[PDB]
C-alpha cells in the first residue's frame, strides 16, 4: 500500500492535490507539480474520511463518508461552503461540468447540485442499480443529457427520462475508473484487474 | 466466487462467496447442505494463537483445490485468500478448518493451489 489514500491532478496538470493520514486524522494537501507547502486542511474528526476528490475550475470538491460534500479553497486553507444531502450515506463518486454537480450515496441515490446557487436541485433513485461505485457524466454539448454509471457492470441512464438506456458487460470486480476517452468510446477499469475495456 | 465438485458423484458441492463464507451444497437434497466451520484447532506446539480477539470471518477464497484419495485421514483441501500470504486447510469429512497453514515463504500472496492425486 501507499501513504497517499487518494490523489488527483488538476485539469491543467500543474498542481496535485493529495490526502494522507496524520496519526488518526486525515490531512489534505496541495503541491505544485511544476517546479514546499506546509499547509494542510486537517479533518478534526477521526471518523471523517474523504471518499471523493475533484478539482474545480479554483476549489476542490471533497466528498466524505459523513454524507456531505465540501468545497475547499486552497489559499484560504478553509472550506468555503458545505453541501449536505438529506441522508448520511457516504458519497461514492462525484463529477462536475461548470455549475452542474452530481453525486451518489451508499443508498444508491442520485443528487444534483448547483455551485452558483448553493442548492440541491433534485434527487432520485433508478431501479436495476443495486450498487454504484462510479458516476461519470457524458460530455455532450453544454448540458448533461445522459450519465454513465458502473458498479460491476456499466449502465447508461437518461436524466429527464430517469431510466437506463444501455448496459455494458463490465468487470467481475468493482469498477474503479470510468473515464470517457472520446465520444462513443469510454474506458473502464476495475479493482484488482489487469484489463481495461473500451466500450 | 468459486465452486467445486466434492466427489466423483454429484452429491456435494463446495462453494465460496464474497461474504467470506464457504458452504457445502448438496444437489441430491437441500437439507444435506451445510456450512463448514471456521473454529481453529488447538496448535500442536502449545503457544497462544495470534489473532484478533473479536472473531472475524476468513477473507474471500480466490482459489480452492479438492481431493478425496485421502478423505477422513487428515486435511484434504487448500484455499487461497485475497491479499494474504498463506493457505488454509479444510477437512470435508470434519467440515471444519484444518490444523495446517501453508505460507509462500517468499513474501508473496498466494495465487495458485493444487493437489497431488
Amino acid at each position: 500500500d501507499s501513504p497517499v489514500l487518494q490523489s488527483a491532478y488538476d485539469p491543467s496538470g500543474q498542481y496535485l492535490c493529495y490526502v494522507t493520514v496524520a496519526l488518526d486524522k486525515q490531512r489534505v494537501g496541495v503541491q505544485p507539480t511544476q517546479r514546499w507547502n506546509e499547509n494542510f486542511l486537517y479533518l478534526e474528526d477521526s471518523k471523517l474520511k474523504v471518499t471523493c476528490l475533484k478539482w474545480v475550475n479554483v476549489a476542490i470538491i471533497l466528498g466524505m463518508n459523513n454524507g456531505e460534500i465540501w468545497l475547499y479553497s486552497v489559499l484560504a486553507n478553509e472550506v468555503t461552503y458545505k453541501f449536505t444531502t438529506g441522508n448520511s450515506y457516504e458519497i461514492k463518486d462525484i463529477d462536475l461540468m461548470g455549475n452542474q454537480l452530481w453525486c451518489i450515496d451508499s443508498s444508491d441515490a442520485f443528487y444534483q447540485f448547483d455551485l452558483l446557487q448553493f442548492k440541491l436541485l433534485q434527487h432520485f433513485r433508478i431501479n436495476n442499480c443495486v450498487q454504484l461505485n462510479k458516476l461519470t457524466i457524458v460530455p455532450a454539448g453544454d448540458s448533461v443529457a445522459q450519465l454513465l454509471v458502473a458498479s460491476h457492470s456499466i449502465s447508461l441512464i437518461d436524466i429527464e427520462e430517469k431510466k437506463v438506456v444501455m448496459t455494458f458487460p463490465g468487470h467481475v470486480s468493482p469498477v474503479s475508473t470510468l473515464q470517457v476517452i472520446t465520444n462513443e468510446f469510454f474506458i473502464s477499469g476495475a479493482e484488482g484487474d489487469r484489463f481495461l475495456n473500451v466500450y | 466466487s468459486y465452486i467445486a465438485f466434492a466427489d466423483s458423484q454429484s452429491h456435494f458441492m463446495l462453494s465460496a462467496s464474497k461474504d467470506r463464507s464457504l458452504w457445502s451444497f448438496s444437489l441430491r437434497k437441500d437439507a444435506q447442505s451445510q456450512e463448514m466451520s471456521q473454529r481453529l484447532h488447538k496448535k500442536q506446539d502449545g503457544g497462544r494463537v495470534g489473532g484478533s480477539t473479536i472473531k472475524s470471518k476468513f477473507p474471500e477464497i480466490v482459489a480452492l483445490a479438492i481431493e478425496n484419495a485421502r478423505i477422513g485421514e487428515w486435511e484434504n483441501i487448500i484455499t487461497a485468500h485475497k491479499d494474504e500470504k498463506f493457505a488454509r486447510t479444510w477437512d470435508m469429512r470434519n467440515k471444519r478448518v484444518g490444523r495446517w497453514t501453508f505460507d509462500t515463504t517468499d513474501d508473496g500472496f498466494v495465487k495458485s493451489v493444487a493437489m497431488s492425486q
Binding site: 496519526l23 488518526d24 | 494463537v49 495470534g50 480477539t53
Partner: protein, 160 residues
Amino acid sequence: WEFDLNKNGHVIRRWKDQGGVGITKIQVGGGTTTTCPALQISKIKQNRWLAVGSESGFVNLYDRNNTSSTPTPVAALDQLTTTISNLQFSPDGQILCMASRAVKDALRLVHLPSCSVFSNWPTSGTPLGKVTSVAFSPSGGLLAVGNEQGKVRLWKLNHY
C-alpha cells in the same frame, strides 16, 4: 525536593513519600510535560497527578491539586511485582501506564481518578515482551511500546 528554577533553584517544599523505600522513578500528570508539551504560553497547565515508582513495584499516587511535609497517597498500586521502569500519564491525565523491564508483559494501564487497573487489556496473548519504552501521542490516543527485541508495537485508544 521541590526547587524553583525561576528563583535560582531554591528549595520551596520538602516532603517524603509515605511508605517509600527503594524508589525508582517519579512522574507528574494532568498538565503540560515532556510527553504533553505546550505550543504557546496560554496552553501552560499544572499537573494534578504524581506517581512514585519503586523496586518492589509499588506505585504511590498523590493528588497535587490537594501542602504538608507528609502527604497521604490516594492509592498504592501493587499489581506489578518488579521494579517500575516506565511511568507515564495520558496527555489528559486520565490514564497512568506503569511498566517494568524485569519480566515479560509487565505493563499495566491505570484508570484515573478511580485508580483502578483495566482488566480486559493487557491479555496473556498481548505481545509486549521486555517492555522498555512507552510513549503517548499528544493527540489521537495512540500508544507505542518498545521492547528489548527492538519491536515498537502500536495501539489506538478508541475513546480518543
